[PDB]
Paper text:
The CHDL [name]/40 is prominently distributed in [name] and is characterized by the presence of a hydrophobic bridge comprised of Tyr112 and Met223 that covers the active site. Class D enzymes are distinct in that they utilize a carboxylated lysine as the general base in both steps, activating the catalytic serine residue in acylation and the water molecule for deacylation. To better understand the structure–function relationship between the carbapenem-hydrolyzing class D β-lactamase [name]/40 found in [name] and carbapenem substrates, we analyzed steady-state kinetics with the carbapenem antibiotics meropenem and ertapenem and determined the structures of complexes of [name]/40 bound to imipenem, meropenem, doripenem, and ertapenem, as well as the expanded-spectrum cephalosporin cefotaxime, using X-ray crystallography. Two deacylation-deficient variants of [name]/40 (K84D and [name]) were employed to capture acyl–enzyme complexes with the substrates.
For the [name] complex, imipenem appears to sample two conformations, which are modeled at occupancies of 0.7:0.3. Electron density for the three distal atoms of the C2 side chain was not observed, and these atoms are not present in the final model. The main difference between each of these complexes is the placement of the C2 side chain, which regardless of conformation, makes few interactions within the active site. In both the imipenem complexes, the pyrroline ring adopts the Δ1 tautomer. A single Δ1R tautomer is observed in the K84D complex, but in the [name] complex, the pyrroline ring appears to sample both the Δ1R and Δ1S tautomers. However, in both imipenem complexes, the Δ1R tautomer is observed, with a mixture of Δ1R and Δ1S for the [name] complex. Carbapenems with smaller C2 groups, like imipenem, would not be impacted as much and might therefore be able to sample the Δ1R tautomer.
Numbering used by the authors: 32 to 275
Write the structure that this text describes.
């Protein structure tokens, strides 16, 4: 019964109230819907930042560079955040967004194989440059919010060109919340290198009845915003639209 004018106004106001500029793309079946207070962001390119971890994991598992139970040991060096100073599986490193683990995985993959696989998957602009362990942070790899939600839709439905078991293993790593019989799978991103800074939350809702609704939030992060604004805006949006 709620007008779409009213949905548009409410979701816009969640971005307005967080004092950011951002878009959330929702995909239902084949239809893409764009909401937020900066709709033109939807087809602009930004660094994927930590969202690239989902593909990094698929590539590393498909090519036998790691298994899902393997423990990546902390090497004992000081790490940007204390929560990263511990031993982790890929799945724990996914949830904490632990760059050192995923950097180790990228080095095991190596520049050549990473380039061939990022091309084969057609992710974003497909260009990873010549440094295998930082191309997702400050260029040259870029991707639009439309491309991110289409990647999430592909993973949610097992349509990427990787084994089914590989896709299932990576999807178990991405479960971040249950809400009234609904499961949210998503990976967050915060590109602190680039100016302006970019924030992501990309994933899908799996509803009770089995339907999967992909989404990609993309916003500008400003000095001294909480990371959890990505979660709050996403949850409020999906709830406003009755998706969760």
């Amino acid at each position: 019964h709620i007008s779409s004018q009213q949905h548009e106004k409410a979701i816009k106001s969640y971005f307005d109230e967080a004092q950011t500029q951002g878009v959330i793309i929702i995909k239902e079946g084949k239809n893409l819907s764009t909401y937020g207070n900066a709709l033109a962001r939807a087809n602009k390119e930004y660094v994927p930042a930590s969202t690239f971890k989902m593909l990094n994991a698929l590539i590393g598992l498909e090519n036998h560079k790691a298994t899902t139970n393997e423990i990546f040991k902390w090497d004992g060096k000081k790490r940007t955040y204390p929560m990263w100073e511990k031993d982790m599986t890929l799945g724990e490193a996914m949830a904490l967004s632990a760059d050192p683990v995923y950097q180790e995985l990228a080095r095991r993959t190596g520049l050549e194989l990473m380039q061939k696989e990022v091309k084969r998957v057609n992710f974003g602009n497909t260009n990873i440059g010549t440094q295998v362990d930082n191309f997702w942070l400050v260029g040259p790899l870029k991707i639009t919010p439309v491309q991110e939600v289409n990647f999430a839709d592909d993973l949610a439905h097992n349509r990427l060109p990787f084994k089914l078991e590989t896709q299932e293993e990576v999807k178990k790593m991405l479960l971040i919340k249950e809400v009234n019989g609904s499961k949210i799978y998503a990976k967050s991103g915060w590109g602190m290198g680039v100016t302006p800074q970019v924030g992501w939350l990309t994933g899908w809702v799996e509803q009770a009845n089995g339907k999967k609704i992909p989404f990609s939030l993309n916003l500008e992060m400003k000095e001294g915003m909480s990371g959890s604004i990505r979660n709050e805006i996403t949850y409020k949006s999906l709830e406003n639209l009755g998706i969760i």
